[PDB]
UniProtKB/Swiss-Prot annotation:
It comes from the Viruses. This is Non-structural protein 3. Changing residue 13 to A: Partial loss of ADP-ribose 1'' phosphate phosphatase activity. It comes from Chikungunya virus (strain S27-African prototype). Interacts with mRNA-capping enzyme nsP1. Interacts (via C-terminus) with host G3BP1; this interaction inhibits the formation of host stress granules on viral mRNAs and the nsp3-G3BP1 complexes bind viral RNAs and probably orchestrate the assembly of viral replication complexes. Interacts (via C-terminus) with host G3BP2; this interaction inhibits the formation of host stress granules on viral mRNAs and the nsp3-G3BP2 complexes bind viral RNAs and probably orchestrate the assembly of viral replication complexes. Interacts (via C-terminus) with host NAP1L1.
Length: 163
């Protein structure tokens, strides 16, 4: 575990993270995809061997000794708000199990279902609260990666509010 487990947020490419493992915002078919998924494919392509996994689950594949945790959030274009919410919470609970099993002291994590799987809605608060619900009982240092300057502010405020 980390000596004083923390949450932090950085506005940069998750492919350049300084953590002991990475969470991919994966698709269910283990395809290169778009956005975070395509950055992860370019950096750790070996990690996409047998990475396909259902919605609401996480599957870890090693790139050398570096773990890539493929976490499949729901596409809110296809799911109802209710079922999508259930699967998004489930994907993060599976991430917490994997982080724990791996014994890492730190993990880089994107906000699942906030990009092309958002169904054109702002899901910052919904996705971040499910992240907190899952990761709060873990002792890894969590570093959240985002792209948008206003999202960085909001995520930073949400972290600092609970401290
Ligand atoms: C979540 N972060 C990303 O997907 C990013 C990808 N690139 C190329 C970036 C450049 C500046 C800041 C963030 C990103
Ligand atoms: Cl960057
Ligand atoms: Cl997404
Ligand atoms: Cl963002």
């Amino acid at each position: 575990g980390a000596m004083a487990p923390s949450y932090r947020v950085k506005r940069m490419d998750i492919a350049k993270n300084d953590e002991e493992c990475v969470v991919n915002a994966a698709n269910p078919r283990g395809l290169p995809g778009d956005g975070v998924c395509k950055a992860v494919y370019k950096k750790w392509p070996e990690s996409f061997k047998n990475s396909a996994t259902p919605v609401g689950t996480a599957k870890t594949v090693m790139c050398g000794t570096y773990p890539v945790i493929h976490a499949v959030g729901p596409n809110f274009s296809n799911y109802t708000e209710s079922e999508g919410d259930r699967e998004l919470a489930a994907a993060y609970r599976e991430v917490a199990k994997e982080v724990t099993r791996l014994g890492v002291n730190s993990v880089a994590i994107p906000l699942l279902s906030t990009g092309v799987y958002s169904g054109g809605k702002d899901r910052l608060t919904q996705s971040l609260n499910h992240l907190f619900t899952a990761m709060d009982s873990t002792d890894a240092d969590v570093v959240i990666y985002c792209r948008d300057k206003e999202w960085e502010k909001k995520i930073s405020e949400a972290i600092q509010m609970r401290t």
